[model samples]
Target: TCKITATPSQFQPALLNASKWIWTGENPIPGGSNIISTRPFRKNITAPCGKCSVCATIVVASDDAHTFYVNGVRIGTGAGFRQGQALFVALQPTWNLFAIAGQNLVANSPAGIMASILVHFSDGTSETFVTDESWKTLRAAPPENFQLPSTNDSNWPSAAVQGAYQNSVWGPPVLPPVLPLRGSNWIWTSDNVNGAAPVGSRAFRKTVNQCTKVAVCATVLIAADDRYTLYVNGATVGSGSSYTVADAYTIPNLHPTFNTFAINATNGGGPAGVIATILITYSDGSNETVVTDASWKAIQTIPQGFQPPLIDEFGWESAKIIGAFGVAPWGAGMVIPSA
Candidate 1:
């Protein structure tokens, strides 16, 4: 295995140059004009838009061990902190202007390396703000809460959310809401062998180059949980967590690219082979689903207890094949309006 270690100087030192930005770096945040600091570890930083929000992930690994301080306060055990690329912390506006100052690093020689942070926005855009002198002075807008649907409920209950319920103890649990179909019910099944059962999580391929524009969405009912992935023009579009995948949320605007959608199911805490049907919601407002690529085949009989996992190395499994998907919404809003 190739062991790669990041040296102090070798680490890219970045500074937030924008009036406001998403910060990710491997050192103490620096200060600028409006941004002032009393100590090296304690400086106020600004946000881009008032309450303009971002998801920040800080990763720290030391030559030995150390502690992390944000604006002077210790967060937790720095030595134990392992911020994966996927792990993120959301920061919203407190009230008016948004400001976070001070990032203290303490250690000996190696100083346990430093910290790395990354910021992502709901907009089809993401910018990495660094902890450098440029971050020191910047403008701060009044704070605003712009968290994704994951956080806000009463206000932003996302496009899909539900609970498990069974009418008669004998009847299978109720299926979660499926995406509304304008034409035909999507092709589906619960049995498979080398291939995944239509009932579980698995991604189907779409010949993106085939069609210029196609709207794709998937909905599945799960007593326990479900997820999905989508691809357009043969590129991964999005993925989703939980039982219901929200395609409309990610691919808000429909485009002229051929699309492929896939869905994968997990019982979560429910029956192993319980059935949940998938439906495709398209932008054309037609209920017909584009068939699977010939290479994609369904094997009916895997041994009774066999379950094939949905592997989305490309992540196109859930959205285009499954209904909803996850990933930073790309570019901008949907090209087509919702039905």
Candidate 2:
């Protein structure tokens, strides 16, 4: 095994540009020379869209050690404050209580904690909580009171705001690389082609060329204003009804060359639109990305006896480009993994 040490400037250039750390904490508890000090921190958060699949994770740094809890259950522990630790926890729909217990290593020494939590919702929005004076602090862990889901923290002591990053005794806070939580595919709709929103049902088609016949996996990221059904090579793949968040479908039977993709999207007579992206991973570890743009074909209505070669027969026209990824209402395209 080999190991090397580097500073921020030495490694920052190699990291993703969008990723950044938000250090948080209230008070810097003094480390007693012969004694230990403990401080507990807590914060509450609510889901924006209410009751959907959401993910939460946290990164923490402290002078001595820390124990993290979510709701009322213990989730993770960290030691050697200078290095820090990261953990994932189950978040609630309405109110999520995040708690951490920070302990000092010894007496008469500098002590504190810096931490941040990130929450990603199904709606393509994200919420971040950083430790600050808004958090609560207590000398010891409460006996089931503060940990309970229904307990009121209005009377609790507000944590004292403290220093940040390397300025504190922890040297520097440790953080994780940023994730593409909104997914990587763009959401393209027909409005881009016509300069006006679509109405009623719409159909789209894209013919992708694959050079390798080896077994490959195809993932189609799709979202529509009302509803949508996808077909691969004239075979039905899947369907979706939600417009708030984009969903994905895995397509099998991807041939070696010239694969056909067809979609039937319908609107509720409102601002009708549809967007989709496709990713194909080959058996030899190669990958291809296909996105909806002006190059795709679109029609106002689904054709009868639609098939692979029929897409170019007559009624199809160049699809309109409406918007890009992360647009309002449609949000970003995401592939929810089956657990």
Candidate 3:
């Protein structure tokens, strides 16, 4: 196994660049003695567009150990605060309470918590929250209070305004692995939204070509709602049902001439759409990327042998664009292939 151990010089900026390392107060306990200290910090966030969020995530870090929670649910736990532990989470239509329990493992050593969050709505808009002086600080963990939205933080004091990125014992956190579906659009034959899509199926197709006889490495990432059967070069490569997650596939033995991709996507009830990105790497070190956009053709009815490279396009119309990447009803966090 190859593990890339990042060196000190390789240190990069934190994913939440605007966030500050915070503790109970301005000065944290320094190293050398034996006594465990834990503190809690949190911030309340609301959607920007007044609509339900489609997808969302957060990147957080601490000087030692940290337990992240969202709306009274445990999200995950992590340490080695140098890098942000980015996590995917679900959200409600209104306010979301993000809480963190930070512990100083070395007893008297430095301790802090920093975090950043992104919430994407179905309307192609988003909201963000980060660690700052405006967040809440507490001396004790209240019973089911800080982790939920109904809990009152009205009397809580503002968190200590700690420092930002510098040459401290702990450096800035690295930027997160970016949101996927690059250059792609949430597309469909109609602008059917969440909980309101018509029951039917649509067939979409697109073909691309490369002139070289040399083989290339190609990978595809796809997201669709309800159900979908994906075809790459006339072979079934993968499929997906969850609009909240995407599926990835390694396209095998792509012909040097024409490589066709087709999808039979179905909508049973709620939000329905499709998006994809195909990355091609040539042996010559050049690259090409294909994304689902207006360039694709679509038909409401399925035809025999529609997935083949050659097909009749007599009645096909251009695939309708609902929004770019991170559209409402299906947000940007849909990159997991296990969906």
Candidate 4:
């Protein structure tokens, strides 16, 4: 679901502060011609018996052009100096490696690569990784297998920081195109299943509270692996069959004081997660937003009377976050269906 943004100049403030552009000092950068530098960063998932069930989204830009890889897989490539790219990547467990080859086309010009990675864990948590001096550098092309986690690079030198983000030379980096209002997490159960695209299902529920007599709009966007049946205020709204494209529904007659939701999400022999967001606009020029996250409760199966406006959730556990928006194996950027 990860796709480039239309606002090419929209810069993410967090990206402006997370890292300084970096390159290998082995080649003279300033007043130099056609500098080709390699930068690699390694991140280790050291959680106790960590499950590789994570979603990672990326924002990147290079001095001129670059090729990107994750654990030796060439995931994507970008060209040009000003245009930024946003994408999703699947990360393997344990020691994961990121490799980049940045090339400067013009002589005596500014050069470096800038990137940021946002990873969502299965424990309803998240983390961010960015390019900086901590990444290693190489003057010559790295070995074919250099991106592998098992490779040894103890002798590599640290990359040199070009300057803080938004330097005069690079200016504010443009992020990818913007999606509709976003704030949700891919969530599942705590029971970890081993193997490729494990099959599973869950019933997720949440409550929203508001105190307005007149409401103008109530929209819910949902996405789940393989298939999903949605309910609102104990009534069936609709059903969808794909997580790649999100489903939109309008809930009517929602109580002015509070509202309830129930969704039966099923996974079809593949990676699984359920994400959703609800936006409510009141008649008094006010709004309340609801998003799926750790606070929501989930159970492996729908219980009797589970779709009611009120139900017992005491035994339900907090939905495990599989990842944030734009995570791979279910990349972002699906258009909201016309409902």
Q: Each model's TM-score?
A: 0.28, 0.43, 0.49, 0.48
What's the lDDT for candidate 3?
0.67
lDDT of 4 by residue, 1-339 (tens): 212111111112224347567777654553234344444543333322543323355677888777777766666689654656755444443446777777766665667887777554444344667888788877666676776667777778787777666563677576553224256777777663442335666788898776545443356777787788888778787888877677666443345566778888887776787888776645333456678888888887668877888787878899887778777666667655421
Q: List the candidate 3 regions with Cα displacement exceeding 4 Å.
A: 1-14, 26-35, 49-52, 141-145, 166-168, 176-339
Cα lDDT tens digits for candidate 2, 1-339? 111121101001111112222122222342213136666677787666443324354666666777777777776678765444655443454567877777777775555666766654444345666777677776555546565557777877777654554344344543432222233332234443433454666778788775544434455666677788878888777788877655655443356566788888876655566667666644332456677777777776677855464455476778765556565545554433211
**Tens-digit lDDT track of model 3 for 293-320:** 9999988878888898887788888998
lDDT (10s digit) by residue, model 1, range 1-339: 111121111011122121122122222321111111111211233445623323333443322233333422333333321221111233332211112322223331111122344333334233454333332221222113222112222321111101011121112211112222222122222333232344444333333222533433232222112454444333344444433223332232223344333333332332222112233333332323333323333223223222223333332222222222221121112221111
Question: In order, what lDDT does every prediction score?
Answer: 0.28, 0.57, 0.67, 0.64
User: Which 10 consecutive residues of model 4 have the lowest summed lDDT?
Assistant: 2-11
In candidate 3, how many Å is residue 4 off?
Answer: 39
Q: Which of the two candidates, 2 or 3, achieves a greater TM-score against the reference?
A: 3
Better of 2 and 3 by lDDT: 3
Which of the predicted structures, 1 or 3, would earn the higher lDDT when compared with the native? 3
lDDT leaderboard ranking: 3, 4, 2, 1
- Candidate 2 residue 161 Cα shift, in angstroms, is 37
- Candidates, ranked, TM-score: 3, 4, 2, 1
Candidate no. 3 TM-score: 0.49
- Choose 1 or 2, whichever is better by lDDT: 2
Candidate 1 lDDT (Cα, 0 to 1): 0.28
lDDT of 2 at 277: 61
